[PDB]
Amino acid sequence: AIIKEFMRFKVHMEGSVNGHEFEIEGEGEGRPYEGTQTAKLKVTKGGPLPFAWDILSPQFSKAYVKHPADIPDYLKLSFPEGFKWERVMNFEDGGVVTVTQDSSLQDGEFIYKVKLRGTNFPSDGPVMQKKTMGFEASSERMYPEDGALKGEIKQRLKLKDGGHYDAEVKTTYKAKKPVQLPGAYNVNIKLDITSHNEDYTIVEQYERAEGRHSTG
């Protein structure tokens, strides 16, 4: 079909965190049906970033989630038109991130456009002081609602000084054309930052994502 075994992507983010505006550009690739991918990102404006990269890392790809055959792969089916999503993240210390995204397919590649606004992070908190050390593996609980696919997750960021820093994330994913919605299931995700330069202006990431049954 139109999604191959191997697919490349291009991503653009504009964003702002606590007033600091930035842009990021990137490129990636992976195995949609295997649920694997990598990306190399660069900050093209407003670098070096005066906040933790970990609040950006999960915003850069839902077509690359391995699904068993009997769970409708709603986000794969949305193509070539693609899909949109809208995400709210509430961090435990009052930080808030909202994100919007458009995905489409152009000349055999995915094209992702992201906008992000983070606000109300305490200035001494672990985001503005760069004290996070990456994401624990997590599970997004998916379920259909009101003509769209919803995802909920509790994210846990590791802190450099021991301990964890949590967020509650809810996401609405909506296909540009009406396609087959799944029922309730789970997506296990591990996301690692595989390399970075000293100021996180060039970052590489790797993500593995797999759909699992919640019932039966």
Side-chain angles (χ1 to χ4, degrees):
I2 77 166
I3 310 315
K4 309 314 159 46
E5 298 294 39
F6 181 67
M7 299 295 277
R8 296 187 176 276
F9 68 92
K10 284 159 180 163
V11 60
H12 181 265
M13 178 185 279
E14 63 174 294
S16 171
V17 172
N18 271 24
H20 187 280
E21 313 189 312
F22 64 89
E23 302 191 357
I24 294 181
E25 192 207 324
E27 218 177 349
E29 68 191 39
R31 313 284 294 181
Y33 302 93
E34 293 174 16
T36 57
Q37 59 181 306
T38 60
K40 180 185 302 80
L41 297 321
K42 40 174 180 155
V43 180
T44 43
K45 314 278 172 159
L49 296 180
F51 55 88
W53 182 267
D54 292 318
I55 65 165
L56 308 185
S57 68
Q59 322 312 336
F60 296 109
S61 209
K62 285 284 150 177
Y64 295 80
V65 172
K66 177 176 163 172
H67 286 74
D70 54 349
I71 301 178
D73 199 342
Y74 173 80
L75 295 180
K76 281 187 189 63
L77 292 156
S78 72
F79 287 98
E81 296 84 358
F83 66 97
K84 306 186 179 213
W85 54 263
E86 146 146 48
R87 172 172 292 158
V88 181
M89 319 178 71
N90 271 313
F91 289 84
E92 67 176 65
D93 66 354
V96 175
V97 172
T98 58
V99 194
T100 56
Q101 201 263 16
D102 183 281
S103 313
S104 66
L105 193 70
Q106 233 281 80
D107 282 297
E109 306 172 356
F110 296 115
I111 309 289
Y112 302 147
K113 298 283 201 287
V114 196
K115 298 203 181 91
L116 178 144
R117 188 184 66 213
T119 59
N120 207 39
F121 289 96
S123 67
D124 57 343
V127 165
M128 300 312 302
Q129 300 290 324
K130 289 176 197 156
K131 292 189 313 259
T132 60
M133 273 197 323
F135 276 99
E136 313 246 297
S138 65
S139 207
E140 186 177 12
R141 309 254 167 280
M142 320 296 299
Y143 64 92
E145 183 180 45
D146 213 59
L149 184 61
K150 311 296 174 95
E152 297 179 353
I153 169 159
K154 338 299 256 301
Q155 304 226 263
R156 293 203 86 96
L157 280 317
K158 274 157 284 189
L159 292 182
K160 281 187 184 58
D161 290 309
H164 292 83
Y165 173 58
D166 298 336
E168 299 177 351
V169 186
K170 192 165 154 183
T171 305
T172 300
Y173 308 87
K174 198 172 187 177
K176 293 188 192 149
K177 55 159 151 39
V179 269
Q180 167 72 296
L181 283 167
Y185 71 109
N186 285 326
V187 175
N188 301 318
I189 307 150
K190 183 154 139 71
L191 167 55
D192 309 320
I193 304 318
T194 53
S195 21
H196 58 98
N197 61 352
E198 191 180 295
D199 58 17
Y200 287 77
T201 53
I202 299 207
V203 172
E204 296 172 46
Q205 316 195 150
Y206 169 98
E207 180 160 297
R208 193 174 188 109
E210 191 169 330
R212 293 287 181 89
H213 294 275
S214 288
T215 59

